[PDB]
Amino acid sequence: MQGHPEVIDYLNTLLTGELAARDQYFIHSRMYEDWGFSKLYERLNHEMEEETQHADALLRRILLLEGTPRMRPDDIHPGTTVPEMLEADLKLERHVRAALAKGIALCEQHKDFVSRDILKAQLADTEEDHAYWLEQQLGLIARMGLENYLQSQI
Amino acid sequence: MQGHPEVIDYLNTLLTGELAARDQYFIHSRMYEDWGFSKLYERLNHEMEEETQHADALLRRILLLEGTPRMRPDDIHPGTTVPEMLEADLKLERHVRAALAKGIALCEQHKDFVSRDILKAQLADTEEDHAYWLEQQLGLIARMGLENYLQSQI
Amino acid sequence: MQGHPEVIDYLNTLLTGELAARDQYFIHSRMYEDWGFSKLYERLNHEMEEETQHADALLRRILLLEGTPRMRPDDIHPGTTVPEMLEADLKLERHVRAALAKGIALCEQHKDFVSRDILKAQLADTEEDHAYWLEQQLGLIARMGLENYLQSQI
Amino acid sequence: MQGHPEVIDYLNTLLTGELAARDQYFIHSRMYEDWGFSKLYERLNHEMEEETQHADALLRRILLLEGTPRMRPDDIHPGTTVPEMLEADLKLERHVRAALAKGIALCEQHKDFVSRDILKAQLADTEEDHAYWLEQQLGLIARMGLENYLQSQI
Amino acid sequence: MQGHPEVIDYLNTLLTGELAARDQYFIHSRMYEDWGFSKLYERLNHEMEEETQHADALLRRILLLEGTPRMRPDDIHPGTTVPEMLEADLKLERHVRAALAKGIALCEQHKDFVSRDILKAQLADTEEDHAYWLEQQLGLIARMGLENYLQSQI
Amino acid sequence: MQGHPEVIDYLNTLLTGELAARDQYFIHSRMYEDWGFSKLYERLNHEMEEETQHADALLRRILLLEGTPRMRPDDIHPGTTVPEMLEADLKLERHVRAALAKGIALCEQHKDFVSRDILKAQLADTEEDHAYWLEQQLGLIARMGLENYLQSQI
Amino acid sequence: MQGHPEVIDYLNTLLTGELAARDQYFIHSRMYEDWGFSKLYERLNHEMEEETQHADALLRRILLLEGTPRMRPDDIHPGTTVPEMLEADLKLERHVRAALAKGIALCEQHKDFVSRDILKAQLADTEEDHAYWLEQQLGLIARMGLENYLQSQI
Amino acid sequence: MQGHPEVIDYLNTLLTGELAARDQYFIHSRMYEDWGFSKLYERLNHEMEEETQHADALLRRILLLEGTPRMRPDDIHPGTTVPEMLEADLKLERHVRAALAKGIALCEQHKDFVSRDILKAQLADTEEDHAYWLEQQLGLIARMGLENYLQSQI
Amino acid sequence: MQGHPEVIDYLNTLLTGELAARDQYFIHSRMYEDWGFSKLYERLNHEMEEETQHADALLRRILLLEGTPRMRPDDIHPGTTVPEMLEADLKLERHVRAALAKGIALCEQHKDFVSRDILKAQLADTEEDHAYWLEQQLGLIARMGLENYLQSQI
Amino acid sequence: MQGHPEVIDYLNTLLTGELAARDQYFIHSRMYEDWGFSKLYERLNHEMEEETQHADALLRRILLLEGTPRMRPDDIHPGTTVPEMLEADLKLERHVRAALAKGIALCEQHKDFVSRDILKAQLADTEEDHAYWLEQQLGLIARMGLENYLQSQI
Amino acid sequence: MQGHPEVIDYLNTLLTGELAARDQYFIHSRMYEDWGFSKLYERLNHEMEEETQHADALLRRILLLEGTPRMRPDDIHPGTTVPEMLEADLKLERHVRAALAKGIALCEQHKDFVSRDILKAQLADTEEDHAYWLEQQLGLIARMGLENYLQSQI
Amino acid sequence: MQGHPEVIDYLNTLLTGELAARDQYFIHSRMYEDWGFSKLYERLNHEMEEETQHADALLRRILLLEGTPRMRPDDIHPGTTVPEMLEADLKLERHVRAALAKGIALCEQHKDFVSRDILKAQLADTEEDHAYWLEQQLGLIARMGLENYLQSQI
Ligand code: NA
Ligand code: NA
Ligand code: NA
Ligand code: NA
């Protein structure tokens, strides 16, 4: 189907944003595992899987709309300590949420309601799972101290 | 059956007290879950379910006695921190225990032994489950510190 | 996440509206059961469960958005006869439908698409299940008479 | 064990009252079945079984207390039409409720708390099952007419 | 195979008659369901399925005979009340029965015995299931009144 | 419920469009089967089933909104060769997509968000299943030739 | 039973026609298998089995009617190439269809309705299975070329 | 449905003929069993069951056609020896075959093709099961002698 | 919870009475087993288990009420012959029954209805199981002689 | 463990090469699926999974060696037609094979035999699965023509 | 087979190194268990099992090569506190890694590729399991403190 | 892939060496079976299977490397007595071990690490299974005498 060139170009932006989010969760999960925090490894591995699915859905939609997917991920900036990693992931999800909301409005204005529903589902995922979960971890650290919290993630 | 108007009016008091206790456990459980304390979420969710059952039993008994149930819950005052929430729940159960004991005596004086047995069962629930469990948590905090304790509730 | 104060305040309005709808279905179901209409008991009990779920979803969303949930239900006005109860439930669902539609528009204007999707799901529930079912009952009464209809609900 | 002669004599009164209630439910169930109301047959047959159990519990308790059980049932007055039968059963349960409450007080005054707990259980049965159920039937008749109601009991 | 042009043209008439009968049972079933008569919904839904199968068999036979199927359904006239709907369905089946019998004779005269056996099977369906069932409903209404009958269809 | 007369009238337009799409997939599937292309038969039969479900959902929604469904399908124009059939189906889905998008906007303007969500689901079906699948077939023909492609559909 | 000598003589004609059709499908199936077309082997083997059943039914019917079955098959003319074989089978089924239709009329005129129903079943088999299937194959060849088609029959 | 008065009257003739055939197989089966021929008992019992089914189908068809079934069986003439019984059954089936064939023609002339198909099925039963089986027995007697044959039926 | 010091002190009395009853059933069961009376061993072992449960319930209740349990059992006086043992157990249960009844009244006067319900359950156990069973044994001895009775307990 | 800085830097090169190979197989698989070649989709999806595993193994090894993984994939150049895609994948695997062999020698020279064994396993995967499979496809195209080959990949 | 005397002598060195590593993990596991750290017990017990397997593989290989295995373990130096034990195990694995790498080079120079592959497998075990796991524990201690960490090992 | 002509030529040497080893184990196994030594038959049959697998792996690798496999086995020299056969197999495995080691070095020098890993696996098989097992047999003969040993192989 012939998609609107502005919608396609912006799905491509969301796509390279998701490819990056996938890769950031990729390296953070494996860093957590290397340090011996299996529960953090599991959760970030799950986020990596979810982003891979999001990227897949964008990519296929771009093809259906007869676009050419942009496959270069955005630049990533991983943490080097547990606090920096959590902060880097907090920045990432805030960014994806903001980009998605813009795409949601763009889709409405070009009357691409199906592309829009795809983005709204990804936004729900980003808020109610990624952001929600990350905020939980930050709050736990605040309530019990970093050491107690990291103990609980072994 | 025609219940004694004083018994009915007091079951209504207990009823609006239980509707409130249900709603307080409702908001506390969901607050604990939002902060990432799944074990506290589970336990307060269970207390919410038990209060809903207590309210149901009162409500049906009021109807059998040909009363009109009062469905407005009492005012609730939830905590905003884990310590305040535990204190608010401690105050609540002390109050329900006191109200139940009064109703138990009232039922005896109007020779409504069945209504009385219902209240005695609810009182046993309130003491041996809610109060007992809450006291356990307070004692644990006292023995290991708030941080260690909250860690154990993740 | 920091939700828009107008969205939060209005979810709170919807929340205290759902807590009320839950309690009205609560008392109506138990009244129908007391009179011996098990089929009406079952259906209103189901509506009570669904409203409890709706309230739960609002409450959690308010917390995720860093609001403070308002836990006092709105005032309820239950019927005293089967005809009044059905009329009271008809008024309730019309009201919830109207409040939801307003919230749906409000969410769009503050670009809270996830809160908006939650409300649209609740609206679909309210129309296609509660309103639809209640209209069916009223129509049946109209087609066969109140006595025949109540017989069928035993 | 040596029971108090006043408690024993009154358990005997309750006993001959239960033997009668058993026999009244006995004849009413079989009358309903003869007329083709299987649902009324089933329910009165169940009440007959429950009264037989109540009588059994009284009888054994009288023996444990070294009394001699009085085995003659009280006089019964069954109906001859469905309305009279329901009225006769309504009178019966009102009577058993009143006799039980008196025995409950008598047991307390002679410090026979175990005999008292037996009576309180029978009273709960009499109110929440027999009386409650019978009131339901009367209300149904009032709401839909005798003919519609009897149709529903086939 | 080269079918006789008169047989083909008449199968097309039967075909557009069946497409219509399908659509009339389609709207009547959904109307009955909307009003809360699940038993009528089920039965008309079944008739809709059977007509869809009849149309399918005609359509395929027309293709085997190297005809071009006419896919526009005949005009339909649904009822707006339960009595009108039953009357509309009574008129429909009388019409299909009459058209089928004519086609059965036509097939015999052009020595298309296989097309004829197809029509005889559809006629048996139309008489012994649709017509028979509809007549049963009309008779029931006549014997017990419309209100009692509609009660039984909930 | 009282639906907005403009929404109802337009659901009726979508409805008669779906009844047609159902019938076009109906005749195309059976034509493909007659020629011996079982894989095309299966897929078009599936599309026919999906359109029947779409029509059903519109029809019921029109009834809930207290409209009168229009049951005459739109005119259809089936192909006579495999290339014409694929082209006719390509034109059909383009048309349904365009009509749905218009209805989606209309529903928003009359604040019928539930009717709107129904249409958005049907649009997703039409794009991601029907249009997507049909485009795949056209592309395959282009890449391997019509003869090779039809061989693969036996 | 004493069958009409004209019916018996004509069942014998149909019988020796079926014995032949069996033998032609016999040799064609085995020729297709020898050349490596297993799918054609399977289908012609099935037709051979069906003709054997048809011959069996005729033979037994001739015996029940106290006739003497004629067991010599008609002359057969098998193809030597795939195109000739398909043409020979096309000629065969056209012939059996024509002979059956004549027998169907003959049976009616001698009031042998049971013999007639047997022939009508065989005719349905011959048209809707053998002729239909063979026409499908010819059409496929026409749409994709002989080479592509034979590839698909391996 | 309004059946043709001549068809109805003749189904009634067939009906009282089947009620008789049922009763003749009834007494013959039980006579064979009394004499110790269990295999003859089983087979005639089966024929009795089949005739009961035939009578049932006629009876229901007469009712659907708004006739009044004639329930008096025709006169029967059972045998008193095995040879007479077999002869009586041979006469019976010849008679039913003749009556059915006449009804089959009558149904065709009044365009009652469904009634006609019912009779053709019964005729097939009568020829291919009853007549065929009875002829087999007579032939066996002829080939091995009555004594050997009766031995084989124990 | 802060229990009333008089209730706590008296639960302690009941507690040291139960610890003793446990130990007396402990030694009697093992004495019966040593002499070869397995049935008496089993029954006294069961009573020992029940008393251990009673002591456990008192002990935990004392802790919930923030008392300090008194863990020294009362003095016990076991028998040395089967008759003395039965007499010692008869004296024990009479004593526990008397102490429990006093505690039941004490609990009522201090409005500790939950502690009271615990004691009433223990009293029911003591009367209907221990006392009842022991009286049965004494009666059996009286009816059949000590030798016959002891034979039956092997 | 402290890895040799030259080994770490080169694993990083292999790592960003694998992240790229993963992404190229990612887009090619989804392109093949969009065009309707499910068998090519499956195979490239499998290669994408295998590269993701290879990248994971490199990444973890880099962490164990106390390096910092480089997470930016190398530039990719996907095809736009089936022939270009196959050529792009042929170039990719030739490149990965060459880079791996160099790393294998480098690992040996720095006596990192474990890192070396990891690379040798990846090389075996790249040759015996990816390269081997791709060469097979190219050869098939050469032997049967592009059209026949693409037909076989549907 | 006649192994090279230098390879044999060095496998013997590796062998007495593994016998020691086995014994050190032996005493450390049992020390951890004695102190109540079951998770450390399990892991060191596993390492002891793995070293026993490594020693077994060396020993058998030495025999196949017609050497005489040296069975005296190297001297071990276990810790006396958790920190010293972890340090002693860190020193051990560093030593085994260094000895293995030397043997790997020695095997290559004497063209004993099978002995070399055995050592490379043991080295992979030593790095990716023992060293990796031990480093994880040290890092955890560093991130959460020794007390928190030891708590997690109970 | 384009393999190095020296590697290919040497894999061909190894290949014709394996084809021979297969054939020698082939004839020895069958000779042992003919003489009644089933245990020797089983073991040599297993070696034959393993060599066939080795030859297969070489052959396929030669094809992947775009070589032409040499399929003539090397000359074999089987024994004629059990002692000569064991000696012939001892010579064979010594030869294959020597040829493999040379190929392993050759592969390294041409940087064909995958071909090299294949050879190292075959060498491990040859040493640890074939050579090891054969040496065991020779040693057994030496320890118990040829007669005792052959007895054990029946
Ligand atoms: Na801690
Ligand atoms: Na009625
Ligand atoms: Na081709
Ligand atoms: Na004989």
Curated annotation (Swiss-Prot), chains A, B, C, D, E, F, G, H, I, J, K, L:
Residues involved in Fe(3+) E binding: E50, D129
Domain of life, source organism: Bacteria
Annotated Pfam families: Ferritin
Family: Belongs to the bacterioferritin family.
UniProt binding sites for Fe(3+) B: E51, E93, H130
Lineage: Bacteria, Pseudomonadati, Pseudomonadota, Gammaproteobacteria, Pseudomonadales
Coiled coil: none
Site residues, Dual function in ferroxidase center and iron gate: H130
Family matches, as SUPFAM superfamilies: Ferritin-like
One of the record's GO molecular function terms: ferric iron binding
Keyword Ion transport: yes
Organism in which the protein naturally occurs: Pseudomonas aeruginosa (strain ATCC 15692 / DSM 22644 / CIP 104116 / JCM 14847 / LMG 12228 / 1C / PRS 101 / PAO1)
InterPro entries the UniProt entry points to: Bacterioferritin, Ferritin-like, Ferritin-like_diiron, Ferritin-like_SF, Ferritin_DPS_dom
Keyword Nuclease tagged: no
Induction pattern: Transcription is up-regulated by FeCl(3) and H(2)O(2).
EC code(s) of this entry: 1.16.3.1
Residue stretches making up the Ferritin-like diiron domain: 1-145
Reaction it catalyzes: 4 Fe(2+) + O2 + 4 H(+) = 4 Fe(3+) + 2 H2O; Fe(2+)(in) = Fe(2+)(out)
Binding site for Fe(3+) C: H46, E50
Its job: Plays a role in catalase A (katA) expression; activity is required for optimal KatA activity and resistance to H(2)O(2). Iron-storage protein that is part of the heterooligomeric bacterioferritin (BFR) complex. The ferroxidase center binds Fe(2+), oxidizes it using dioxygen to Fe(3+), and participates in subsequent Fe(3+) oxide mineral core formation within the central cavity of the BFR protein shell. Can store up to 520 iron atoms per ferritin protein molecule. Iron release requires only the input of electrons from ferredoxin NADP reductase (FPR), does not require Bfd. Does not bind heme.
Annotated positions binding Fe(3+) A: E18, E51, H54
Name of the protein: Bacterial ferritin
Enzyme class: oxidoreductase
